[PDB]
Amino acid sequence: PFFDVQKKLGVDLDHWMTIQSAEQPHRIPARCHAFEKEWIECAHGIGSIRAEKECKIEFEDFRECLLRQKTMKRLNAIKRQRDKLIKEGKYTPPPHHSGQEDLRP
Amino acid sequence: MSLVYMNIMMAFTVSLTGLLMYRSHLMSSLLCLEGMMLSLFILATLMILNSHFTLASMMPIILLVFAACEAALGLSLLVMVSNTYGTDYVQNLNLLQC
Amino acid sequence: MFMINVLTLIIPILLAVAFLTLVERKVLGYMQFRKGPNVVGPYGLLQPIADAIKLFIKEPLRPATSSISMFILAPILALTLALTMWIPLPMPYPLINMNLGVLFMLAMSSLAVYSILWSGWASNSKYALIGALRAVAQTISYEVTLAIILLSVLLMNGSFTLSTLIITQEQVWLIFPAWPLAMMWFISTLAETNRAPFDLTEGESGFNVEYAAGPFALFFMAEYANIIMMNIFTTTLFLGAFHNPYMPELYTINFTIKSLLLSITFLWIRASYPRFRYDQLMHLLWKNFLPLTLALCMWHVSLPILLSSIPPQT
Amino acid sequence: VAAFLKNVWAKEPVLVASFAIAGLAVILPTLSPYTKYSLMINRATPYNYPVPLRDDGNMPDVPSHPQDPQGPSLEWLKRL
Amino acid sequence: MMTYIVFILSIIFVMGFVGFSSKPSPIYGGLGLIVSGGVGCGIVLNFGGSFLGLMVFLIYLGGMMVVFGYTTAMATENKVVLGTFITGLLMEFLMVYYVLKDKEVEIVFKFNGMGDWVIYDTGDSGFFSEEAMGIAALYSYGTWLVIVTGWSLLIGVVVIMEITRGN
Amino acid sequence: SMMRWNRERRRLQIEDFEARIALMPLLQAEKDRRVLQMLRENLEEEATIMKDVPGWKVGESVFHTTRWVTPMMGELYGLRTGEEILSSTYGFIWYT
Amino acid sequence: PGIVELPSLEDLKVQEVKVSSSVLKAAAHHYGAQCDKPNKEFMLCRWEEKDPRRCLEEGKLVNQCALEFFRQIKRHCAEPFTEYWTCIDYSGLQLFRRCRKEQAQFDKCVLDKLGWVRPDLGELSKVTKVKTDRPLPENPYHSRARPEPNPEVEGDLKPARHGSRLFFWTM
Amino acid sequence: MNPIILIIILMTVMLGTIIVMISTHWLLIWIGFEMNMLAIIPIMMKKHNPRATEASTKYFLTQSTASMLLMMAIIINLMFSGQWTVMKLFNPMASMLMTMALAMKLGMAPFHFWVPEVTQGIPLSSGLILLTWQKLAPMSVLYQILPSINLDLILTLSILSITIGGWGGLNQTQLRKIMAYSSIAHMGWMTAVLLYNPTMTLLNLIIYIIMTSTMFTLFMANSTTTTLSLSHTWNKAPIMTILVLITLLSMGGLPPLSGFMPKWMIIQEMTKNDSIILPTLMAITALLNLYFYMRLTYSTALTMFPSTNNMKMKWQFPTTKRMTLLPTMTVLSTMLLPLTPILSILE
Ligand SMILES: CCCCCCCCCCCCCCCCCC(=O)OC[C@H](COP(=O)([O-])OC[C@H](O)COP(=O)([O-])OC[C@H](COC(=O)CCCCCCCCCCCCCCCCC)OC(=O)CCCCCCCCCCCCCCCCC)OC(=O)CCCCCCCCCCCCCCCCC
Ligand SMILES: CCCCCCCCCCCCCCCCCC(=O)OC[C@H](COP(=O)([O-])OCC[N+](C)(C)C)OC(=O)CCCCCCCCCCCCCCCCC
Numbered sequence A: 001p002f003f004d005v006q007k008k009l010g011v012d013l014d015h016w017m018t019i020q021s022a023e024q025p026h027r028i029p030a031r032c033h034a035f036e037k038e039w040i041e042c043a044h045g046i047g048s049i050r051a052e053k054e055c056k057i058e059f060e061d062f063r064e065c066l067l068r069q070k071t072m073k074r075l076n077a078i079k080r081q082r083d084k085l086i087k088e089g090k091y092t093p094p095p096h097h098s099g100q101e102d103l104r105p
Numbered sequence B: 001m002s003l004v005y006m007n008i009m010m011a012f013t014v015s016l017t018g019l020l021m022y023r024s025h026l027m028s029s030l031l032c033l034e035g036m037m038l039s040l041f042i043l044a045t046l047m048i049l050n051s052h053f054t055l056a057s058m059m060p061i062i063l064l065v066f067a068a069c070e071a072a073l074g075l076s077l078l079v080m081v082s083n084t085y086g087t088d089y090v091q092n093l094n095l096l097q098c
Numbered sequence C: 001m002f003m004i005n006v007l008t009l010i011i012p013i014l015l016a017v018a019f020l021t022l023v024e025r026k027v028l029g030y031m032q033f034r035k036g037p038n039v040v041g042p043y044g045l046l047q048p049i050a051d052a053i054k055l056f057i058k059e060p061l062r063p064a065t066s067s068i069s070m071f072i073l074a075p076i077l078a079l080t081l082a083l084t085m086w087i088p089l090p091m092p093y094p095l096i097n098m099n100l101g102v103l104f105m106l107a108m109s110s111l112a113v114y115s116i117l118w119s120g121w122a123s124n125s126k127y128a129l130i131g132a133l134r135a136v137a138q139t140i141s142y143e144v145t146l147a148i149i150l151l152s153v154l155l156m157n158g159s160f161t162l163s164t165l166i167i168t169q170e171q172v173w174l175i176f177p178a179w180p181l182a183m184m185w186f187i188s189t190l191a192e193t194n195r196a197p198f199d200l201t202e203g204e205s206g207f208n209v210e211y212a213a214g215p216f217a218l219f220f221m222a223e224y225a226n227i228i229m230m231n232i233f234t235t236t237l238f239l240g241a242f243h244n245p246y247m248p249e250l251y252t253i254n255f256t257i258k259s260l261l262l263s264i265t266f267l268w269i270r271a272s273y274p275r276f277r278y279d280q281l282m283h284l285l286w287k288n289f290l291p292l293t294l295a296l297c298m299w300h301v302s303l304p305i306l307l308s309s310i311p312p313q314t
Numbered sequence D: 001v002a003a004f005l006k007n008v009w010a011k012e013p014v015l016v017a018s019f020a021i022a023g024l025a026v027i028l029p030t031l032s033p034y035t036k037y038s039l040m041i042n043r044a045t046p047y048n049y050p051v052p053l054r055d056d057g058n059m060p061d062v063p064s065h066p067q068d069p070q071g072p073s074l075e076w077l078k079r080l
Numbered sequence E: 001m002m003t004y005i006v007f008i009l010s011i012i013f014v015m016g017f018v019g020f021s022s023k024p025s026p027i028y029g030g031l032g033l034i035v036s037g038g039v040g041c042g043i044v045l046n047f048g049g050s051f052l053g054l055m056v057f058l059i060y061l062g063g064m065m066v067v068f069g070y071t072t073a074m075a076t077e078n079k080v081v082l083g084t085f086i087t088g089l090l091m092e093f094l095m096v097y098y099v100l101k102d103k104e105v106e107i108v109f110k111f112n113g114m115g116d117w118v119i120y121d122t123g124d125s126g127f128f129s130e131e132a133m134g135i136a137a138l139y140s141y142g143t144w145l146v147i148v149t150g151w152s153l154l155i156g157v158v159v160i161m162e163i164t165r166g167n
Numbered sequence F: 001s002m003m004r005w006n007r008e009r010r011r012l013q014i015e016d017f018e019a020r021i022a023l024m025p026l027l028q029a030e031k032d033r034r035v036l037q038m039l040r041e042n043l044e045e046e047a048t049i050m051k052d053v054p055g056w057k058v059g060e061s062v063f064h065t066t067r068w069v070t071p072m073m074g075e076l077y078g079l080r081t082g083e084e085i086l087s088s089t090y091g092f093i094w095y096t
Numbered sequence G: 001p002g003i004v005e006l007p008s009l010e011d012l013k014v015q016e017v018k019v020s021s022s023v024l025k026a027a028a029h030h031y032g033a034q035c036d037k038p039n040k041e042f043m044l045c046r047w048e049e050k051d052p053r054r055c056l057e058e059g060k061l062v063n064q065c066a067l068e069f070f071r072q073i074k075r076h077c078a079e080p081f082t083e084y085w086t087c088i089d090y091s092g093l094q095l096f097r098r099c100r101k102e103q104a105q106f107d108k109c110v111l112d113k114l115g116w117v118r119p120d121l122g123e124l125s126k127v128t129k130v131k132t133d134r135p136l137p138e139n140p141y142h143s144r145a146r147p148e149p150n151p152e153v154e155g156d157l158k159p160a161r162h163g164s165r166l167f168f169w170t171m
Numbered sequence H: 001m002n003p004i005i006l007i008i009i010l011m012t013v014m015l016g017t018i019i020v021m022i023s024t025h026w027l028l029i030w031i032g033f034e035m036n037m038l039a040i041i042p043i044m045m046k047k048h049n050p051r052a053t054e055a056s057t058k059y060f061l062t063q064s065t066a067s068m069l070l071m072m073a074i075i076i077n078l079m080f081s082g083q084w085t086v087m088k089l090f091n092p093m094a095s096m097l098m099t100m101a102l103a104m105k106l107g108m109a110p111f112h113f114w115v116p117e118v119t120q121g122i123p124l125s126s127g128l129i130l131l132t133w134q135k136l137a138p139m140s141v142l143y144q145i146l147p148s149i150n151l152d153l154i155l156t157l158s159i160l161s162i163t164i165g166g167w168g169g170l171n172q173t174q175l176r177k178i179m180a181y182s183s184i185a186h187m188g189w190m191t192a193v194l195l196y197n198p199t200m201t202l203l204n205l206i207i208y209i210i211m212t213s214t215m216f217t218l219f220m221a222n223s224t225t226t227t228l229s230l231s232h233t234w235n236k237a238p239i240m241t242i243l244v245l246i247t248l249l250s251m252g253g254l255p256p257l258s259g260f261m262p263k264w265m266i267i268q269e270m271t272k273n274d275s276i277i278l279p280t281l282m283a284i285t286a287l288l289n290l291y292f293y294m295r296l297t298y299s300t301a302l303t304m305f306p307s308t309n310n311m312k313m314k315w316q317f318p319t320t321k322r323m324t325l326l327p328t329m330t331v332l333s334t335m336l337l338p339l340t341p342i343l344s345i346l347e
């Protein structure tokens, strides 16, 4: 049972720490505020059964914001091909990726 | 995912297997239980700091406080066992097999 | 360059702790209508040197220990914690300027009871273990009022920053709005360092009677490395000096003089009273300091709100 | 009401001072006139950026410049 | 080598738990859990959770493991231990060799083998620690949480005084 | 005395925060050009590195949305030296 | 998915404000006073577009108006400003409060030679309105179509047809 | 124990169950379980004897391990979902860990190995609290996460609980251990129908709580903790043997009693979902617990026993024990089957 006392009495006991998209102190956004907002606004009211199949793309974007598995996989691929071309000698790093250019601002 | 999370979960599972099947001092079981709590603190802290989810920063302190109160309760049970047998050997806790 | 700063922190700490023994013996001498050391150096100035060399060439016990490793780890932890308490102390600038230096010092001083507990473990004497347990319960009792008094004052500071506490007292000393906190704080720091009237390691045999002159000189000096620190901490906390940013040595001379007078006040307290019975200082903490400290913590929670004097966060 | 109070002030003055300071700390922010200004200063402290509004055409109470006379002011804080 | 320092601490953290879950004694079990709390606290401090790191030092190590060592002193006056220790250490170092030779591993979940410096954020937070203001929110947004925690601690005091009496 | 001085200190804190606020648009503009600079440099170096790999799309987004995603730390400092990496990832934490 | 579009390096070249943080902090109140409009057009575009690639040109206007802010200091009041940001620059926290007479010299020379009034306590933290010509973003999150909600309940509530219909219970 | 302190501690047990029932945040679920455990520990140590200290230590260790596994499940949910709603979980590993942790809190097999011991070591009223009130909160959490519960895990735990609760009580002469293995078997019956129809799970929970409350209230009314002392009841109060007769016949599932009501409905909700073999062997195992109930009432409740002479002193005194709700609970635990469609109020 979920006796929803908080909605029946109209009190906010623990809805505030529940999601990252809620009102934070000093309006601090979470890192995946936009993704979680998009997925929550997709899955709202349609039930969990329709949400698991009709909001898959928002949930994959949000889970990949959280864990960054695809981004780290792409960085692994680029850094590994770069290490292979450094070991073979077919590539050289530029002066702005070796630390010789005295950064912009 | 993150690689430090694997080490924190492996620490949790090490202390979980240390709790489960040894049949030793009761204090060693409470130490394994609070190692489980320590790894939960570290893991909750790294996740909440990682995601910049500000309102859950008070969450691990809660995870500390309750569980440390829990730890206090466990020690008192141990002390009652330590006031009954003179030891905290858990094989003295076999009166209720029959 | 930073290593030079670390060394000019920690080597003068050990020298000041060495000459604090001379100041203790001299000031206790004249208060007891006699002299302290004046033979070994001119005006006794070579007495700590001769004493440290004498201890370092005595035979240690190396007894039958329950743990050899914790017999080694108790002086190392004692000296390491006694030296790391000084690193956020703003005088007027700290070695490590950290945002949470007050909470850092509170946590590291809470870690100091393991030296007492492991020194009671390492001696096989069960009575030394009893005295160590009484010392640990004394120290963890007075850490409670340290934490709550310190919280009540940092409600007037605005942050956990130790260097902000100089900015806090630019007009008035913080002993004027918080003298009941200051006097309970001072007696509680006196009870933290096992210092008379709260010492229970000379009479009814302490936790460190197993140590003889190899580690003992280290333990002792780590213990006095806490004492000066606590007074310096009290000097930062209730007697904040004038800081001119173009002449920092004005602050350094001013807080140095106040910290010397407060350490001499420790010496002048221990030469004036008998000791507590053990349950009498437990009665002092749990029944006299703790209700007042909770009441004044409520007062220093509600007071900046009712005067519109909430301090800045930054 | 004064016999028990003088009795506890003769026997337990620590607890009398404790309950008195605690009672003052409870009841006195409901009687102080400055408790409003604590709230007012803690909302006047700009931790975030004052994110501007798109001028729709009719917002007379919103200024067009920081030095404009309309908007919230802090003269109550500069005077006190 | 300095870029992987969190990772390096995490390895010690795992080692520290195998240091005490082998359980030679509650004495050395407590010592291993204190060293483990220190290194996991270093992990927490290296992500910017300075207040939560000082809560590990003040409350876990300085508050609670003191009471565990105290009760170990007062109430509690090999082959299995060393074997379980070296078994867990061999398991962890083979995991380190796998994840450093592969930069990818799967025990239960899929784990990257690069350092966790990549997964951070590039922004700033102005004049506050976000973690500090989130813990400050316990008194403004966390009312029900304060109520249930204070009631649990009051009940905890009452419960300890009940069961330690024996009457 | 603490009432007068903490009211003065709150006024001084508001003055510091307003100096920060007035500087924030210039810092925001420089930060935006900073991160777009680093992403364009990483894009060109990816285009000159990732040609040997078949089936590779250079600059391919891992997100199904087309919304701007704030660049991750390893996205920006992923192809630079370990000194700048260590600075940008633990400088503020390790600062004194 | 798709290719993330990035502007070229020529689209990011602007003359930088290459001054220190104490220099920026010294002139910050007069900067927020005099460089109001392009800074607020930029920060409005920046909170509305939620995309820095759509906020380059306004940002260039910021970097156009900041430099003209400092040139107008450098032509007139270079020495009192220099004496002021040096004193700001000494402090480790960069206190305004340690530097009030140099502030007074800089404010005097700025009000005399440029007519600029320094903002008071509470002015630069105001929410102001910005009149731009750029249109309002109709979908700043690039959100797709939301799923249609489930059908709600309608119709008057009738009794159960022959009760529970549970094996033999007729009600 | 001071009665004011007893009231406060029982209200804290109830408050922890209420916090688990009403809260939307997983941390408050964990807090409610912590509050419930911390408050129930003195109720078990009411008489202050070493068996209660052993029972409370074993209960503490099992519920603490379960609470740590629950928090690890919540934390993996936070990894893979970035949020804290008490709803379905977003990882099968969090699903497995939370199902394991709630199975440890209920006492389901293979984590059943504390329920016969702890119930033996504690008094009858605290054993009543343990076997009735402490089932409400984890069944609420299982009620709310059932879109994420792995079917094979919950059915493995369920049928393992039913077999071990069946073949564990055949050997038992202690009444508290009979009730504890009956508890394990009924929690298997509740959790096997959970993913099919959770209303029948609630029906089984309420009928079980009524029958268990009836049995422990009769045990407190007769002060009998063993089979042989239960046999000495007819010569003191003959109606109490009749009531333990009809209530033990109801707990095994005889028609036309009310304890036949849930499990029949459970079979009725498992053949709809085309599971035939599973409720068949499930009720085959329930026939074994009904069968040792029929030995434990045929051989040792009906046919009247050798008594002792001191019982003829106890004829001169009536029961002054407060048998609170005992006739109501005895009527409801036996004569409720004609109102079997009342279950719709639990939908
Ligand atoms: C203008 C406004 C005012 C107008 C006023 C007009 C009325 C004035 C008179 C006022 C009194 C009215 C009485 C109630 C209405 C009539 C009830 C009735 O006859 O139901 C027929 C009902 C079905 O017959 P029907 O031809 O379909 O319906 C004819 C009517 O239209 C019946 O209506 P229906 O078609 O709507 O039936 C609905 C449905 C019809 O039922 C069904 O659809 C099938 C489901 C029935 C339940 C099956 C459960 C089987 C497993 C459990 C067996 C338990 C053990 C057996 C009993 C052992 C002792 C407790 O009922 C149920 O499902 C509810 C359960 C059955 C309750 C029956 C009433 C009991 C009241 C007295 C209780 C005393 C014990 C009675 C027997 C208890 C066992 C039932 O008969 C049975 O189920 C067999 C049991 C006998 C009926 C009870 C007779 C009540 C009076 C008994 C006096 C003697 C007492 C002796 C001492 C105590 C016993 C040791
Ligand atoms: C930091 C700078 C220095 C600080 C000052 C300290 C320097 C001087 C030190 C002198 C030597 C001390 C050696 C150790 C002594 C330890 C023993 C001792 O003193 O025990 C403490 C004693 C303990 O009591 P006791 O031991 O004397 O008596 C026995 C206890 N009873 C009575 C219960 C049987 O007193 C205290 O605890 C007082 C602590 C400070 C109280 C502060 C009160 C504030 C006043 C508020 C207003 C009150 C007026 C009424 C309300 C008005 C409302 C508007």
Ligand SMILES: CCCCCCCCCCCCCCCCCC(=O)OC[C@H](COP(=O)(O)OCCN)OC(=O)CCCCCCCCCCCCCCCCC
Binding pocket: C073, C076, C077, C080, C081, C084, C097, C098, C099, C100, C101, C104, E034, E035, E037, E038, E039, E041, E042, E043, E045, E046, E050, E053, E054, F092, F093, F094, F095, F096
């Ligand atoms: C038996 C074993 C051996 C026993 C003897 C030796 C151990 C005991 C004595 C040493 C104790 C070490 C304590 C180290 C951590 C102290 C807490 C801390 O670092 O706080 C300071 C600060 C927080 O302030 P903040 O200003 O927010 O940080 C800068 C951000 N602007 O944070 C910072 O400045 C962060 C700086 C980077 C992170 C620092 C991590 C330090 C290393 C981890 C702990 C190592 C010790 C482990 C053992 C502890 C005791 C068991």
Ligand SMILES: CCCCCCCCCCCCCCCCCC(=O)OC[C@H](COP(=O)(O)OCCN)OC(=O)CCCCCCCCCCCCCCCCC
Binding pocket: C291, C292, C294, C295, D008, D012, D015, D016, D017, D018, D019, D020, D022, D023, D026
């Ligand atoms: C409402 C305000 C806020 C209240 C909550 C906050 C309180 C802050 C302080 C916390 C104190 C915690 C511990 C308090 C325990 C109180 C009970 C107590 O001590 O009773 C026992 C005592 C007799 O002492 P004994 O038992 O012998 O102990 C050994 C010492 N001889 O008997 C006594 O000492 C008698 C104590 C009762 C009489 C005290 C009266 C003080 C009046 C001060 C002025 C009015 C203050 C306004 C509030 C009313 C307070 C009653």
Ligand SMILES: CCCCCCCCCCCCCCCCCC(=O)OC[C@H](COP(=O)(O)OCCN)OC(=O)CCCCCCCCCCCCCCCCC
Binding pocket: A001, H010, H125, H126, H128, H129, H132, H133, H136, H205, H206, H209, H210, H213, H217, H220, H322, H323, H324, H325, H329
């Ligand atoms: C969807 C779910 C929502 C929630 C639904 C409601 C769930 C209800 C669960 C009820 C659990 C009751 C647990 C026991 C009562 C709690 C307090 C208690 O233990 O009272 C017993 C009390 C102890 O007194 P003491 O002095 O310690 O006794 C020792 C003997 N000298 O006194 C005694 O020992 C006296 C002897 C008789 C006690 C009988 C108590 C019966 C209580 C259960 C009533 C039936 C259940 C409620 C109806 C169904 C609800 C599902």
Ligand SMILES: C=C(C)[C@H]1Cc2c(ccc3c2O[C@@H]2COc4cc(OC)c(OC)cc4[C@@H]2C3=O)O1
Binding pocket: C017, C018, C019, C021, C048, C049, C051, C052, C055, C216, C217, C220, C221
């Ligand atoms: C740290 C240095 C340089 C030396 C000097 C020194 C030690 C070690 C221990 C001690 C010490 O100096 C003094 C010596 O004399 C007394 C006499 C005391 O009482 C007569 C007394 O009471 C607490 C304390 C003491 C100090 C004490 O223990 O190492």
Ligand SMILES: C=C(C)[C@H]1Cc2c(ccc3c2O[C@H]2COc4cc(OC)c(OC)cc4[C@@H]2C3=O)O1
Binding pocket: H291, H294, H295, H298
């Ligand atoms: C000892 C226990 C647990 C049970 C088993 C048992 C009794 C009491 C009585 C009897 C009994 O065994 C049964 C066996 O088979 C039938 C079958 C019957 O009908 C199918 C039938 O009808 C009255 C009667 C009987 C026996 C009978 O009298 O208590």
